[PDB]
Write a protein that binds this ligand. Sequence first.
Ligand code: FES
Ligand SMILES: [K+]
Ligand SMILES: [K+]
Ligand SMILES: [Mg+2]
Ligand SMILES: [Mg+2]
Ligand SMILES: [Mg+2]
Ligand SMILES: [Mg+2]
Ligand SMILES: [Zn+2]
Lengths: 162, 154, 97, 45, 84, 222, 38, 176
Amino acid sequence: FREVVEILDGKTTIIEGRITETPQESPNPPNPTGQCPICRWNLKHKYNYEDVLLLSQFIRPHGGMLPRRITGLCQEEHLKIEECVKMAHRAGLLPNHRPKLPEGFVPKSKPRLNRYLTRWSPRSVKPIYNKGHRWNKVRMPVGSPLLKDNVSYSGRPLLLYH
Amino acid sequence: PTINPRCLPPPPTPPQEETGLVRLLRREIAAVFRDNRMIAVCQHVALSAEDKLLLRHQLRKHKILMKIFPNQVLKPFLEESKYQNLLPLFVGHNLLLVSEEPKVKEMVRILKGIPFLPLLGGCIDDTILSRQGFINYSKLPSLALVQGELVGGL
Amino acid sequence: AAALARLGLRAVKQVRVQFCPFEKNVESTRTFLQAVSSEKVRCTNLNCSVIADVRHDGSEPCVDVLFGDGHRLIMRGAHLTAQEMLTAFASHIQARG
Amino acid sequence: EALAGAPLDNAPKEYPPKIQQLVQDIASLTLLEISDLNELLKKTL
Amino acid sequence: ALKDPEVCTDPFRLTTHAMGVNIYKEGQDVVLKPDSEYPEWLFEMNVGPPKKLEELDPETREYWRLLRKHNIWRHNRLSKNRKF
Amino acid sequence: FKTLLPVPTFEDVAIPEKPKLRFVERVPLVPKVRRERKNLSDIRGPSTEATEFTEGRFAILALGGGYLHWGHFEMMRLTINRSMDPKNMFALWRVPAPFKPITRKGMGQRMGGGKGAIDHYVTPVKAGRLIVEMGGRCEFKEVQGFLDLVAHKLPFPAKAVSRETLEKMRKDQEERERNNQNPWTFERIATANMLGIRKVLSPYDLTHKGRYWGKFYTPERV
Amino acid sequence: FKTKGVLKKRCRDCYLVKRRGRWFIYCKTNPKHKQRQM
Amino acid sequence: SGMIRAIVRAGQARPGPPLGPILGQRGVSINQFCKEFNEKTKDIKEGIPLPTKIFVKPDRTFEIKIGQPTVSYFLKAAAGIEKGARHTGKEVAGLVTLKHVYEIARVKAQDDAFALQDVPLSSVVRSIIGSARSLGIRVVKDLSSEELAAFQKERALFLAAQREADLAAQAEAAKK
RNA sequence: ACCAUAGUAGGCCUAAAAGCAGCCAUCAAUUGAGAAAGCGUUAAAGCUCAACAAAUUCACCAACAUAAUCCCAAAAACUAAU
Ligand code: FES
Ligand SMILES: [K+]
Ligand SMILES: [K+]
Ligand SMILES: [Mg+2]
Ligand SMILES: [Mg+2]
Ligand SMILES: [Mg+2]
Ligand SMILES: [Mg+2]
Ligand SMILES: [Zn+2]
């Protein structure tokens, strides 16, 4: 990992990059012939928004997500990982991956409302004033359709719209 | 399918066929590296069209020509050739100077007339030089003068 | 290069580029040199001298700039990328002008 | 084959070995052969 | 009001002298030299129609020079539906 | 540096005289004085006439069924004529002039009395029938641009198709039918009269194989 | 703005952006190109 | 402040169009051009087109550099025709030998466009031939007086047919 | 991203038609760039896109307003289901 240091020393600005030692991949994966990292460790269709230990390796220190080129994930899995990270942040997990702003933490606001499996964003959904009868019912989405391929031990399909 | 084909190892690599245009550049690079004694590399810089044409005319006065080759057909060629040590100079944008009966006294003067046209290096008579080596080679006398002074020292 | 032209390079006094073309971590410095030496950037102040210093065993790819206010921006670009170097150069222009 | 490493002027200390062996070969000749060597060089150059 | 100067109409002089070449008032018509003295490369150019795509050779820049020109023609026609 | 791919060459295509679309009359020369029943079987089901190319290489494929009258013919003719090059493009009608009369009884009158008077004329079109066929010495990309505008304004849903594209969507309607992993298909259940389903299905559903319902054609049903 | 059904770029400087659950065509050179999906 | 591409007859700068509205728009009077350009060339006949480059300076001053005449006038004079063919390819306007094209090459080889690039002699002659492709004049390997004479008579008959046809065409348009 | 130079206001046409009413041809310098794909000008000028080089995650297509007394079971994405 490389970091940029900018120093001001008497009307002289010096900018230099320093290399920090980076943790490497574990030595023995169960499926050495895999292509993308997710299916190389037999993690295909076996992770969810709860798996913080997996989603904390494809995100930036300030909550952003690394590009697909660097990680090497396939497009199908990259979107699923992207969806899970968005759901993880809204669920309240990953508390150390928020940016630091000393001026803004002091003015507290209304207490946070606990939530999980939020498909959309809190500021972009409008109340369902006219719900409707059973033959034309506006169903509140829960979870994402990208995670409907996960393994179901119970065997019943996941109820995405309820 | 039981396993998605994306996760499976890739199929055998199809053999790409080199077309006529690629093969045309291969022999031109071979030709320009064979019959020419001086090969000077340079960092190509986006200049004015009038100024770029003016540079061509000025280099024409001393029989010096310049050509541009893409790295797609030049880096693989130089890697297999005896000039593999010029590869670090052919990573980014580049410009190639070609001359017969090498003489860099009139070439460096043009280069120093424009302060933003770097002279990276090059190979002169199968000998790789840096910019300082080019400068020392420029101040060096000709074959007749040096050999004429050789008998004086012996 | 297009970014620098829009931002008014007229407030820059002198720019020099010292790099070793035979090294491996000088690709970023080469790209920075070509962007600041483009024709569009040149046609903003006909007094600014761009110097392309070339060495072999210097082993320190560096860029030094002097602004009109009188500040000395020197960044040794060996691990920095071309975008990082140009963006820092662009940022200082607006603040110092 | 391969070309040379292009030594710089920062630490220029290694001269070509071909020159060194030529110096030894020249120095390994008598003064009579010096005149022969000089006359041939003068005739050619 | 502005027109080109009157040109020669004598077939004998036109076939032996190029009137348009001499543009100086003080100059004179340049007499035709024998065709043997003329360089042989001026009797080798394609006087007739330009070479097609097949008359060229893949191992020659002329084929790629013409194929490059054709690509621009193909791209120009496909761009007729620009809304910008 | 990129790859100089070869360009298609169109030198064997001959442009016929009057390449623009022929004018179509509002009413046939000899009017039909006898009013006939409004057959609706002329829309239902797949088309059997004009399902293959004859001269051109591009055409408008009719996915659904519907009626074309003189208004739609004007829209198709005017749009194509002012948008193509007469030197390089030639177009051909694939449907006849409006011939089937349509009856409209007077405004605001009690039911009864009899069939009204003939109002206008229409052209029945089934599913899978080419409407306008165009050919020339140009590629399909530019022809597709101004054909989707015409196809969008047709009553039935339609697409702009070529010789290669039409075969690809017909060669994929068979691969999707050969590799179906569902043991039960509409063809098997309907023909064999399983579950006594013939009481619900129509006699035409034996031939339609469940892909046609009224005038609507769903291509994704196997 | 102009509430429309399908969004199309009238000039090459129009850039799509999804805000508040809808796609907006925002233009810098020509403000008249601003469109809003309904 | 800019560059102006203008074709002016040798020493015939008129105080009007197309020189007036163009050169005067930048802020340069025509009387200045009536002395500079007219005295710039005095051994060149008037009526021969001359493409000139005018560099207008921010202080409203100007600089003039004169180049070789256009290819169109050279080949029309070489073929002895007063104008180019109306329909290139369908008809041949003039016939010239390879000497006319080759001799023109040396005249245009000193033009600032070609001389700066130091193009070979083969470069210029191909451009003239390429220009003749659109000019309507066909290059001929070699011809004599009578072969050229036969073309002149045939061209005159076709020209006369078109000359009178145009007169009828204008009358038809006006009356209708 | 980056980047734009030759014959040449091509012929004809028009009051003026300079790649850019129309007609006709569509050759040609340069390793590289269409007698022009779009914008613009009275006409020019100018901007942009194809071609140089540089460089290489992926990118066909899929957007559609509202009714009148008060919304309308409550609620729920996995402990094993022919
Ligand atoms: S390639 Fe197998 S899951 Fe990504
Ligand atoms: K429709
Ligand atoms: K025109
Ligand atoms: Mg060409
Ligand atoms: Mg481009
Ligand atoms: Mg409304
Ligand atoms: Mg209730
Ligand atoms: Zn816009």
